[PDB]
Design a protein around this ligand. Sequence first.
Ligand SMILES: COc1ccc2c(c1)COC/C=C/CCCCN(C[C@@H](O)[C@H](Cc1ccccc1)NC(=O)O[C@H]1CO[C@H]3OCC[C@H]31)S2(=O)=O
Ligand SMILES: [Cl-]
Ligand SMILES: [Cl-]
Ligand SMILES: [Cl-]
Ligand SMILES: [Cl-]
Ligand SMILES: [Cl-]
Ligand code: NA
Lengths: 99, 99
Amino acid sequence: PQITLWKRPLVTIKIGGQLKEALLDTGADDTVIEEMSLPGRWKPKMIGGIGGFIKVRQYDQIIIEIAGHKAIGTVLVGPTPVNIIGRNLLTQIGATLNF
Amino acid sequence: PQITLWKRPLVTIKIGGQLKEALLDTGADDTVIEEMSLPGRWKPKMIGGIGGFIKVRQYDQIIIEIAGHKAIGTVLVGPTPVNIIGRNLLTQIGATLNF
Ligand SMILES: COc1ccc2c(c1)COC/C=C/CCCCN(C[C@@H](O)[C@H](Cc1ccccc1)NC(=O)O[C@H]1CO[C@H]3OCC[C@H]31)S2(=O)=O
Ligand SMILES: [Cl-]
Ligand SMILES: [Cl-]
Ligand SMILES: [Cl-]
Ligand SMILES: [Cl-]
Ligand SMILES: [Cl-]
Ligand code: NA
């Protein structure tokens, strides 16, 4: 699609068989999702957002569908105000910015 | 242009007579610039991202030039770690997300 920005670019994602809503976020290096269970081991990660730094759980090689496009990559889990799809997975679905 | 997302989508902006680098950020509702003075009236606001909230000054009707394209709208000024061009000005330069 071509998504304009007059409203938030929210899409449906599917992770662990569950549908969720997430924000396509070109200002995020990383994908960050609200507390949920994911398989496998996780590693520690700190991310610095507008308000300061938080701890998250980094799960690698997670299968996630984004607006009907399949991706497999790193998902950070932690107390983000909104689920966000960052550039690590926007590149996997072929997204670009255009003007 | 078409901007891929392998790297942060940074562009040069001109605001308040100053040249700065800023992130084209589809996950930001509004534009947030590091501390600087701007002319005119402002009012305080709180915005809440990863890491929590910061207090900013809201200036309305500010003209920016974004990668050579002029736009006018609200700019929030405050202790953001990165300058951000959010949706309120991305719409004005006709930016879309495409995949
Ligand atoms: C009202 O106008 C607003 C304007 C901006 C924001 C909000 C409201 C707050 O809007 C509420 C939404 C919050 C959820 C997502 C955060 C949205 N935000 C934009 C988002 O793109 C930030 C932009 C940024 C970039 C660098 C540093 C600070 C901030 N990126 C970010 O947090 O990414 C994290 C995950 O990947 C990592 O890579 C970059 C840092 C880290 S925000 O800054 O909190
Ligand atoms: Cl869960
Ligand atoms: Cl990844
Ligand atoms: Cl200044
Ligand atoms: Cl505006
Ligand atoms: Cl339009
Ligand atoms: Na003003």
